[PDB]
Amino acid sequence: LMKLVSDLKQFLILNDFPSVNEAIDQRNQQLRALQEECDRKLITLRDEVSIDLYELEEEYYSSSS
Amino acid sequence: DHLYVLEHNLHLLIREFHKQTVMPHPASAPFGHKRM
Amino acid sequence: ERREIVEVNKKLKQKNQQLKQIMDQLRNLIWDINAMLAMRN
């Protein structure tokens, strides 16, 4: 009976009615930091790619024979 | 074409969802949109 | 003399074709990234 009561208490306090909703906020912060790093990486990549693309266009369009 | 507009449409639908939720700093009871 | 010039021109044309083929994918990726990161939020 004690084991079953402890199990039911852990069940109801685990995810049934736990007032601790800060886990959602922590997940929000983690995922937002992840997507911000991803966006920054993509932006740096596109900037480098654009620089290289302009440097390549300058040699492609101005060379024909 | 095969992939970009896919992501664009998915993000458009999730933006629709997010817009269907805007906080106007209300006091009495406007409960609407700022630009509205 | 002239044959060497013709061969060099052919090699340059092949290199320019490969260069255009690479630039096509380059600008495609640039457009894709710049248009996908713009629809964010």
UniProtKB/Swiss-Prot annotation, chain A:
Subunit structure of this chain's protein: Component of the Mediator complex, which is composed of MED1, MED4, MED6, MED7, MED8, MED9, MED10, MED11, MED12, MED13, MED13L, MED14, MED15, MED16, MED17, MED18, MED19, MED20, MED21, MED22, MED23, MED24, MED25, MED26, MED27, MED29, MED30, MED31, CCNC, CDK8 and CDC2L6/CDK11. The MED12, MED13, CCNC and CDK8 subunits form a distinct module termed the CDK8 module. Mediator containing the CDK8 module is less active than Mediator lacking this module in supporting transcriptional activation.
Disulfide linkage: none
Protein name: Mediator of RNA polymerase II transcription subunit 22
Protein family per UniProt: Belongs to the Mediator complex subunit 22 family.
Coiled-coil portions: 19-48
UniProt function note: Component of the Mediator complex, a coactivator involved in the regulated transcription of nearly all RNA polymerase II-dependent genes. Mediator functions as a bridge to convey information from gene-specific regulatory proteins to the basal RNA polymerase II transcription machinery. Mediator is recruited to promoters by direct interactions with regulatory proteins and serves as a scaffold for the assembly of a functional preinitiation complex with RNA polymerase II and the general transcription factors.
Localization: Nucleus
Species in which this protein is naturally found: Mus musculus (Mouse)
UniProtKB/Swiss-Prot annotation, chain B:
Subcellular location(s) per record: Nucleus
Taxonomy, superkingdom: Eukaryota
Role summary: Component of the Mediator complex, a coactivator involved in the regulated transcription of nearly all RNA polymerase II-dependent genes. Mediator functions as a bridge to convey information from gene-specific regulatory proteins to the basal RNA polymerase II transcription machinery. Mediator is recruited to promoters by direct interactions with regulatory proteins and serves as a scaffold for the assembly of a functional preinitiation complex with RNA polymerase II and the general transcription factors.
Membership in a protein family: Belongs to the Mediator complex subunit 17 family.
Subunit structure: Component of the Mediator complex, which is composed of MED1, MED4, MED6, MED7, MED8, MED9, MED10, MED11, MED12, MED13, MED13L, MED14, MED15, MED16, MED17, MED18, MED19, MED20, MED21, MED22, MED23, MED24, MED25, MED26, MED27, MED29, MED30, MED31, CCNC, CDK8 and CDC2L6/CDK11. The MED12, MED13, CCNC and CDK8 subunits form a distinct module termed the CDK8 module. Mediator containing the CDK8 module is less active than Mediator lacking this module in supporting transcriptional activation.
Protein name (Swiss-Prot/TrEMBL): Mediator of RNA polymerase II transcription subunit 17
Parent-protein start and end of this portion: 364 to 403 of 649
UniProtKB/Swiss-Prot annotation, chain C:
Any single GO CC term annotated in Swiss-Prot or TrEMBL for this entry: mediator complex
Primary localization class, coarse: nucleus
Lineage top rank: taxon: Eukaryota
Keyword Coiled coil among UniProt keywords: yes
Coiled coil: 1-36
Keyword Transmembrane helix: no
Family membership: Belongs to the Mediator complex subunit 30 family.
Protein's job: Component of the Mediator complex, a coactivator involved in the regulated transcription of nearly all RNA polymerase II-dependent genes. Mediator functions as a bridge to convey information from gene-specific regulatory proteins to the basal RNA polymerase II transcription machinery. Mediator is recruited to promoters by direct interactions with regulatory proteins and serves as a scaffold for the assembly of a functional preinitiation complex with RNA polymerase II and the general transcription factors.
Subunit structure: Component of the Mediator complex, which is composed of MED1, MED4, MED6, MED7, MED8, MED9, MED10, MED11, MED12, MED13, MED13L, MED14, MED15, MED16, MED17, MED18, MED19, MED20, MED21, MED22, MED23, MED24, MED25, MED26, MED27, MED29, MED30, MED31, CCNC, CDK8 and CDC2L6/CDK11. The MED12, MED13, CCNC and CDK8 subunits form a distinct module termed the CDK8 module. Mediator containing the CDK8 module is less active than Mediator lacking this module in supporting transcriptional activation.
Listed name of the protein: Mediator of RNA polymerase II transcription subunit 30
Parent-record interval covered: 138 to 178 of 178
